[PDB]
Amino acid sequence: QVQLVQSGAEVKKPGASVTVSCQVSGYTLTSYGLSWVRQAPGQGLEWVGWINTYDGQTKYVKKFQGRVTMTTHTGTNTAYMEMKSLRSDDTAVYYCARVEGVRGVMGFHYYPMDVWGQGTMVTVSSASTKGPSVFPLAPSSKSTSGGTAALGCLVKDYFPEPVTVSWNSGALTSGVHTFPAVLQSSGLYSLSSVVTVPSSSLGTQTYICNVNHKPSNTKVDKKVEP
């Protein structure tokens, strides 16, 4: 029962820098090694750096030497991963797992990394934060297809993902299906949340998507009616 707390997913422009933090529960990180692996979106995995608590040893990838750097707070039972002068491409998911290569070993090889951290999502894009535009989407005509009707909302041109859409503060949890946002050639995402409510109530009950964006602090509620 060893847990790993990873710093809240962060996002920063290229050239800027971020720092991932890893926590440990149960076995003190001190008597365990550690390494970090990047997980580019559907790109496979790539080992990056390696540190050894109570051993102050460090080994990095020939590729990002200098740019990245390890750290360890033996006092708080948490490890750190520093990345300066970030690069647009480098953005991806990052993890931190245990390693046996400690003390006399020094070398990582032998050890079979165990217990990976939930992860940290970092992003690098010259696109600055934006406020989501909420526009209502109702049937062009009573759908009457199979059953009921499909009405929803459309948040377009917003960064950085994602913003939680809540129909009537959660009064409408039935039928709601928010489709995965998409990266516009412009550089700003866009998602949609549609619901399946009876076509016999297109005028009995109104619907409002509570699009609340933390990045832009933009709370926009919209009404959806034919």
Partner: protein, 50 residues
């Protein structure tokens, strides 16, 4: 304090990442009256522990 010396019991965590060095001590009364007076109960006792 006053007419009583409650069994003192406190704690202090070492959040900091560096080793802490606490220097304490125990008093050796020269007389019983000095003991019972300065420390109430005649039998003192210190129990530092990590």
């Amino acid at each position: 304090s006053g007419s009583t010396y409650p069994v003192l019991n406190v704690t202090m965590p070492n959040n900091d990442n560096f080793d802490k060095l606490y220097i304490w001590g125990v008093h050796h009364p020269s007389t019983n009256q000095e003991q019972t007076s300065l420390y109430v109960q005649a039998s003192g006792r210190v129990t530092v522990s990590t």
